[PDB]
């Protein structure tokens, strides 16, 4: 069901031919999500899943791509009868969006591993009858486009996907699952999740994609991993070129995570004449502040990781402090575990390892060490303050004694004379938001940190052992 204009670049014989196809679609009224996802999935299959016989690039012949496209459009058109679901106003109904979601869902293999790589694209849906969680939402949006439902768009948080539709684009619908052993809400709005102030729904400051941002999503969804220790250079290159195409056209302006992904690719292999990784990380953070009320966590995590990899201790700590200053205004809810895992790993593994190395390099005579900078100690404390404030008012606790051992260790990496330099001011100077950290303030400047008292203050524990 492709138009003649869409077929003139085939066969696609290189990365650059795939880029030309994406450029041509992005210059159309609406880019064809089904075409583009089939092409990416095809090239990913033969560059990452099965490279047998590869000599340069897996040539994408029009006959192959058109046949896959026709299997998809046939399946959706045959199963979704639009006359049953009248469309006033160029707006779709909830029943129609649920029907499309049901068609995709009911097409999937009954039993498979949902955490596998390379099951994100419509190539995987057609050839393997397998999709990952977010891949189901994308497929629902692709199918809706194939049906002419111009109002159906992808909605994205930092860990979930759904759709928006309807009068003025204001309706939301769940179309896929989230997590594992979680309870399916397909068909429902996202309003309870927004109202609960969970991270998963971003207090409503989630991405509402247009078709060009949906193209960006598919590009971010490229998975170059061949296995746990090898990536496809071709797919890394393709992703990187496609992200720059999107960037140049303005389609990453409202997509912080994509700017972070691009920055990460530039760190690995910089493109001459382009902005440095740091510039791109800061663009991502600016996009979150401009469009999403500064309510996103990953722009700062992206930044912090870059600094961590480059052993920039000061700037890593600053960026993780900023991560925590975002999370403090959320409630920790039942399906937010991925972000809990992220903060846990930063607090309890990554920061400790960084500080351990800094302690060895200080012993070796390093100058300007983060461990001698009271501003760094203030960032450490702001990080914990944000996590403690996150926990306030939440339906489920965050801190436990497992965190306290690392907090004491990390505090102890700064000498008392450095720690004493931070002035904790009530509403370097630091103001605490959390009641836990306010109560901890006197304990933070002792020469020898009182480990048991810190533990008591950080956790729900209020008594010491009887004997």
């Amino acid at each position: 069901g492709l138009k003649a204009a869409q077929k003139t670049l085939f066969p696609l014989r290189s990365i650059d031919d795939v880029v030309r196809l994406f450029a041509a679609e992005l210059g159309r009224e609406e880019p064809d999500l089904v075409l583009l996802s089939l092409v990416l999935g095809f090239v990913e299959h033969f560059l990452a899943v099965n490279r047998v016989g590869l000599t340069y690039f897996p040539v994408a012949d029009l006959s192959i791509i058109a046949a896959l496209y026709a299997r998809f459009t046939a399946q959706i058109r045959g199963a979704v009868d639009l006359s049953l679901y009248p469309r006033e106003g160029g707006v779709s109904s909830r029943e129609l969006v649920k029907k499309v979601s049901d068609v995709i869902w009911n097409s999937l293999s009954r039993s498979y591993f949902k955490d596998r790589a390379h099951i994100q694209s419509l190539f995987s849906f057609i050839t393997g009858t397998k999709l990952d969680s977010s891949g189901v939402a994308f497929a629902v949006v692709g199918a809706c486009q194939a049906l002419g439902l111009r109002d159906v768009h992808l909605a994205l948080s930092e860990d979930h996907a759904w759709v928006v539709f309807g009068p003025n684009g204001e309706q939301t619908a769940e179309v896929t699952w989230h997590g594992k052993g979680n309870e399916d809400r397909r068909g429902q709005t996202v309003n309870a999740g927004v109202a609960e102030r969970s991270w998963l729904y971003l207090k409503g400051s989630y991405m509402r994609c247009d078709r060009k941002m949906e193209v960006a999503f598919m590009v971010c969804a490229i998975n170059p991993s061949i296995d746990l220790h090898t990536d496809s250079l071709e797919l890394l290159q393709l992703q990187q070129k496609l992200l720059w195409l999107l960037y140049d056209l303005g389609h990453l302006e409202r997509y912080p995570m994509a700017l972070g992904n691009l920055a990460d690719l530039e760190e690995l292999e910089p493109t001459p004449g382009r902005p440095d990784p740091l510039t791109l990380y800061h663009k991502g953070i600016a996009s979150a502040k401009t469009y999403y009320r500064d309510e996103h966590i990953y722009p700062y995590m992206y930044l912090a990781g870059y600094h961590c990899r480059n052993r920039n201790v000061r700037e890593a700590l600053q960026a993780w402090a900023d991560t925590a200053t975002v999370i403090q205004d959320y409630n920790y809810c039942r399906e937010d575990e991925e972000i809990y895992k992220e903060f846990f790993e930063v607090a309890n593994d990554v920061i400790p390892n960084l500080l351990k190395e800094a302690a060895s390099l200080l012993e070796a005579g390093s100058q300007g060490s983060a461990l001698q900078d009271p501003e760094c100690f203030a960032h450490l404390l702001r990080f914990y303050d944000g996590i403690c404030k996150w926990e306030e008012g939440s339906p489920t606790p965050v801190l436990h004694v497992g965190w306290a051992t690392f907090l004491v260790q990390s505090l102890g990496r700064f000498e008392g004379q450095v720690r004493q330099k931070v002035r904790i001011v009530s509403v370097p100077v630091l103001t605490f938001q959390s009641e836990k950290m306010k109560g901890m303030k006197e304990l933070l400047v002792a020469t020898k940190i009182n480990s048991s008292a810190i533990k008591l203050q950080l956790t729900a524990q209020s008594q010491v052992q009887m004997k």
Partner: peptide
Amino acid sequence: SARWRFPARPGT
């Protein structure tokens, strides 16, 4: 074995 991650989530 290669695994899924949410698209453009940072880290490995």
